[PDB]
Structure formats: structure tokens, C-alpha cells
Design an enzyme around this catalytic site. Structure first.
Site, PDB file in Angstrom:
ATOM      1  N   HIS B  41      -6.143 -12.796   6.985  1.00  0.00           N
ATOM      2  CA  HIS B  41      -7.141 -11.864   7.508  1.00  0.00           C
ATOM      3  C   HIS B  41      -8.386 -11.727   6.606  1.00  0.00           C
ATOM      4  O   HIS B  41      -9.442 -11.268   7.085  1.00  0.00           O
ATOM      5  CB  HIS B  41      -6.494 -10.502   7.778  1.00  0.00           C
ATOM      6  N   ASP B  88       0.297 -13.552   7.913  1.00  0.00           N
ATOM      7  CA  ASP B  88      -0.958 -13.266   7.233  1.00  0.00           C
ATOM      8  C   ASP B  88      -1.081 -14.046   5.930  1.00  0.00           C
ATOM      9  O   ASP B  88      -1.009 -13.518   4.815  1.00  0.00           O
ATOM     10  CB  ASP B  88      -1.115 -11.743   7.024  1.00  0.00           C
ATOM     11  N   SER B 173      -5.730  -7.076  -0.696  1.00  0.00           N
ATOM     12  CA  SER B 173      -5.176  -8.092   0.238  1.00  0.00           C
ATOM     13  C   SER B 173      -5.309  -9.475  -0.347  1.00  0.00           C
ATOM     14  O   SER B 173      -6.315  -9.780  -1.019  1.00  0.00           O
ATOM     15  CB  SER B 173      -5.925  -8.083   1.546  1.00  0.00           C
ATOM     16  N   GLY B 174      -4.296 -10.296  -0.098  1.00  0.00           N
ATOM     17  CA  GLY B 174      -4.319 -11.638  -0.623  1.00  0.00           C
ATOM     18  C   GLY B 174      -3.717 -11.785  -2.012  1.00  0.00           C
ATOM     19  O   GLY B 174      -3.400 -12.900  -2.423  1.00  0.00           O
TER      20      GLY B 174
END
Ligand SMILES: *[C@@H]1O[C@H](CO[C@@H]2O[C@@H](C)[C@@H](O)[C@@H](O)[C@@H]2O)[C@@H](O[C@@H]2O[C@H](CO)[C@@H](O[C@@H]3O[C@H](CO)[C@@H](O)[C@H](O)[C@@H]3O)[C@H](O)[C@H]2NC(C)=O)[C@H](O)[C@H]1NC(C)=O
Ligand SMILES: *[C@@H]1O[C@H](CO[C@@H]2O[C@@H](C)[C@@H](O)[C@@H](O)[C@@H]2O)[C@@H](O[C@@H]2O[C@H](CO)[C@@H](O)[C@H](O)[C@H]2NC(C)=O)[C@H](O)[C@H]1NC(C)=O
Lengths: 4, 218
Positions: B41, B88, B173-174
Site C-alpha cells: 500500500h 500487503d 508501514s513497510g
């Protein structure tokens, strides 16, 4: 729900 | 990271900052010298020609000659579903090979299909928001979290901090989740704002994707  | 702590400089040399126009927006993990792994995402509709992949960083507000910067040559996706927030995960092939050293190293991944039990203790990390007490972290943060299954699902690794409000937040995120020395998660989504103290944080379940990852980086 919230990306992040 | 809300309610975490500063990492020791270069404690996590696989940790990567993804940046646009000099600004961090997501983390990633170095998984081979010319590949990083992040959350799909993070690059949804992003012009990936604009993304800078920054290795060897600690304090995003300082000049650091430890850093190595790369562009993205190619993206490999695996069915990211933005409605259900599944798969994701993305691999970004770099435009060259990192120089592996004290401050830039490749992460170790779990075996395909390896499950984590309730109560596994992991470290989350990243350069995301500290709260709206503070802003984006300058210095890389880490946080002890515990794996949970209540209010989780089999398509995520979920984590909670017991006894206080703490967790991942926007900009994390990530970023990797390290459990027993292996990268078991990629930070994906929160519920009910960051650090609710109620809803576990959700990570992409890296062990489910190991064969896929291996097919690309080998
Ligand atoms: C908070 O998090 C740290 C770090 O977490 C550990 O390492 C991360 C990279 C991930 O792999 C995590 O999954 C992992 O839990 C925890 O630190 C660890 O604490 C343990 C228990 O005290 C240490 O194990 C002991 O080591 C001593 C020797 O130093 C032996 O004598 C013992 O037999 C025992 O094995 C371990 O070294 C330490 N790891 C690191 C990297 O510091 C920490 O416990 C955790 N705290 C809480 C409350 O969750
Ligand atoms: C691989 O790419 C890096 C970084 O490229 C930068 O980031 C991209 C998103 C895009 O904005 C590029 O135009 C940027 O240059 C290269 O590093 C640059 O190398 C050039 C030429 O040597 C140099 O002028 C700059 O100082 C470098 N920029 C940074 C930010 O470090 C690198 O050379 C490329 N490696 C290859 C092709 O092997």
C-alpha cells in the site's frame, strides 16, 4: 482499519 | 512508533527508509543487496520513479555518510487487496547493489509457513509518528510488542502492547517486525487510531510469502  | 524508544545507532542495519523529495513516508527491509521488501500500500499509485530507497540511516534529521541511496528499477507485487487489506507486500528491485557493511546488512527471513504462537515477543521499529504529541521521528524507534490472536485473523500477524497504549503509527508501514531474530512481519495497518490499547496492530505475515520472495531474489 487504517493503512500506516 | 508510539511509546517506543530510540534504537541504538545502526542496531538494525536491514532497516530502510523510503522517501519522496527527501521526506520519509514508509519503511522497508533489505532482503538482498539489490532488493527491499515493503508494504504494497506504500507504493499504491505512487510514481515509483520518485522514490528514493535510503539504507544505512539512523537520524533522518542529520547528515549521515553511512547512508546509501538507490532508485527503484522494478516492482514485484503479490495480489495486494486494498478492500480487505490482504497481501500487503511488495518487493522493490534497486538500480544497483547495496554495499553490505556494519550499517547496511541483509535481513534473515523465516521458513515458509512458520507460525508464531500467542505470546511471542517481537520488536517493531520505524520512523513513523511518535504521536500527535510529537511528529515523525528523527531517530529510528523500536518497541517491544507481543503476538496475539484475539481480534486477529490468519492472514496477518497481529501484535499488542500490554498494560499501556503503544504501537506502530503512520510512517511505520513497510517496516520490519523482528521475532526471534527473523523478519516475521511487515507493518500494514492499525485499527481505531494508533496505539489504541485495544485493537492489535496488523503486519503482513512474511512467513506466508517466503517461497514467493525466494523466487524473486534468487
Ligand atoms: C524486549 O525486546 C528485547 C529484544 O527482543 C529480542 O530480540 C529482538 C531482535 C527479537 O528477536 C525479539 O523477538 C527478541 O525477543 C528482549 O531482549 C531479550 O531479552 C532476553 C530475555 O532477557 C535475552 O535472553 C537472555 O539472554 C541471556 C544472556 O544475555 C541468557 O543468559 C538467558 O538464558 C536469556 O536467553 C535476550 O538476549 C534479549 N535480546 C536482545 C536482542 O536484547 C526483551 O526481553 C524484551 N522485553 C520484554 C519485556 O518483552
Ligand atoms: C541508482 O540511483 C541512485 C539515486 O538516484 C537518485 O534517485 C532517483 C529517485 C532519481 O531522483 C535520480 O535522478 C537520483 O539521482 C544514483 O545515485 C546518484 O548518482 C548520480 C550519478 O552518479 C549522482 O549524481 C548522485 O549524487 C546520486 N544521487 C544520490 C541521491 O545519491 C546511483 O548512481 C544509481 N546507481 C546506478 C545506476 O548504478
Amino acid at each position: 482499519l487504517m493503512x500506516x | 512508533i508510539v511509546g517506543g524508544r530510540r534504537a541504538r545507532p545502526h542496531a538494525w542495519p536491514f532497516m530502510v527508509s523510503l522517501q519522496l523529495r527527501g521526506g520519509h513516508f514508509c519503511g522497508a527491509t533489505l532482503i538482498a543487496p539489490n532488493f527491499v521488501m515493503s508494504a504494497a500500500h506504500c507504493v499504491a499509485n505512487v510514481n515509483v520513479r520518485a522514490v528514493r530507497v535510503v539504507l544505512g540511516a539512523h537520524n533522518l534529521s542529520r547528515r549521515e555518510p553511512t547512508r546509501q541511496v538507490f532508485a527503484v528499477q522494478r516492482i514485484f507485487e503479490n495480489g495486494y487487496d486494498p478492500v480487505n487489506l490482504l497481501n500487503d507486500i511488495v518487493i522493490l528491485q534497486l538500480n544497483g547493489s547495496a554495499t553490505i557493511n556494519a550499517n547496511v546488512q541483509v535481513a534473515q527471513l523465516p521458513a515458509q509457513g512458520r507460525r508464531l504462537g500467542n505470546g511471542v515477543q517481537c520488536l517493531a521499529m520505524g520512523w513513523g509518528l511518535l504521536g500527535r504529541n510529537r511528529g515523525i521521528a528523527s531517530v529510528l524507534q523500536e518497541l517491544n510488542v507481543t503476538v496475539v490472536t484475539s481480534l486477529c485473523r490468519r492472514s496477518n500477524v497481529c501484535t499488542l502492547v500490554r498494560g499501556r497504549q503503544a504501537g506502530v503509527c503512520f510512517g511505520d508501514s513497510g517496516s520490519p517486525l523482528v521475532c526471534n531474530g527473523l523478519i516475521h512481519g511487515i507493518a500494514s495497518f492499525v485499527r481505531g487510531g494508533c496505539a489504541s490499547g485495544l485493537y492489535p496492530d496488523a503486519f503482513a505475515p512474511v512467513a506466508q510469502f517466503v517461497n514467493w520472495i525466494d523466487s524473486i531474489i534468487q
